[PDB]
Amino acid sequence: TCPFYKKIPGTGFTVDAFQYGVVEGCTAYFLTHFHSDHYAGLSKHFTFPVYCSEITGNLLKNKLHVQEQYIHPLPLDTECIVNGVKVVLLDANHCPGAVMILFYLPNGTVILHTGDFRADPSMERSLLADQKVHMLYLDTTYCSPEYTFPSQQEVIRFAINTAFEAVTLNPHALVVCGTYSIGKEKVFLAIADVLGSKVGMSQEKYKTLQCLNIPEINSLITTDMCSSLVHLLPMMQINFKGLQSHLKKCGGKYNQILAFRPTGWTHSNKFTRIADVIPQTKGNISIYGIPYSEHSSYLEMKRFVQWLKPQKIIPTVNVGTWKSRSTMEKYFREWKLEAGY
């Protein structure tokens, strides 16, 4: 049964609610982004209207085989009427195709559902500038002050310089980047661009990347592994055993691996600056964990909320324990007292 924080009151709508069977009264199912916890339940047998971005729609059709007649893509930054209700989709700054949804309810209430997002000051100059929001359904993944991490630009600068140094010292080194979902593509694209290489990968991952509307993608990726010195591998293979096994398959072309594991936050963020990050090393294999986040830091989240000044906040992450719910409620009240709304 569908929980309350996935329903939009006063409408026939749900958000990211495909794992509950047929939801009573639902006339349109919104999907914020193509991550498995959110799409859980969709397939070729789904026969209700799905509303989403263009990119999410390409993934639903090609990867999950949802039939074309049930996929309803909407453009971004554009007022659209769905089942008699005005909606807008906004870029969430999460993975490719990810959106926030603004709903203009028939009674005058305005609701923003962030989906998953990485708040940014640029959002203060979207269509959100123009009006009041009564209810915010908020991605609270990192809603605690211990959650700190650098900008995505700093993290990419670190990865490019690390890869470029290693391969210039040793032309026979291979770079490997872990993946398990869409998102974080800048990590492997930036490294391959500095090395003058295409990115090599499986047929299955190539298919996924071909759905993402990335400009000039045919120039950047390939399924011919032997032609490439940046390889993508499943995240589970990014360990000394998996990497050893991969280096055997390359036919004595390479004699060293440098690997990257993009994570979210880890507690080594509580002590170490990005610049000071060191790898784990066994023999001719080195593995870097890099804190490339596609969710708001505490401070980015707080800035956004204090600017938007919502009347009520409904968290969508960390909702399962009393201690988490209490902690989030305390911070929301501080933020409101501090800013005066």
Judged by the rule CB under 5 A, the positions of this chain that interact with Ni ion are 35, 116
Question: Taking the complex as a whole, how short is the minimal distance between the CB of residue 116 and Ni ion, in angstroms?
Answer: 4
Q: How far is the CB of 16 from Ni ion (least distance, A)?
A: 10
- For residues 256 and 170, the answer to whether their CB atoms sit within 8 Å is yes
Counts for the chain of helices (H) and strands (E), in that order: 8, 18
Pull the structure tokens for residue 136: 């915010």
Token readout for 332 is 């929301």
**Residue among 116 and 185 whose Cβ is closer to Ni ion:** 116
State the amino acid at position 325 in one-letter form. Answer: R
Residue type at position 199: V
Residue whose CB is less far from Ni ion, 97 or 289: 97
User: Minimum CB separation from Ni ion for residue 204, in Å?
Assistant: 20
What is the closest distance, in whole angstroms, from the C-beta atom of residue 100 to Ni ion in the complex?
12
Asked whether 279 and 308 are in contact (CB, 8 A), the reply is no
Question: Least distance (Å) from Ni ion to the CB of residue 38?
Answer: 6
Where are the strands (E) in 184-272, listed by range? 199-200, 221-222, 230-234, 256-263
Cβ proximity of 305 and 185 under 8 Å = no
Q: Would you say 96 or 150 has its CB closer to Ni ion?
A: 96
DSSP for 61-80 reads HHTS---GGGEEE--SS--E
Phi-psi region of 204 (alpha: psi -120 to 50; beta: other; left: phi over 0): alpha
Alpha carbon 140 to its chain centroid, in Å, reads: 14
What's the CA gap between 153 and 103, in Å, rounded?
Answer: 32
Minimal distance, residue 322 CB to Ni ion, in Å: 25
| Nearer Cβ to Ni ion (116/300) | 116
Comparison of 31 and 123: residue with beta carbon closer to Ni ion: 31
8 Å CB contact between 95 and 180: no
Query: Least distance from C-beta 33 to Ni ion, angstroms?
Result: 6
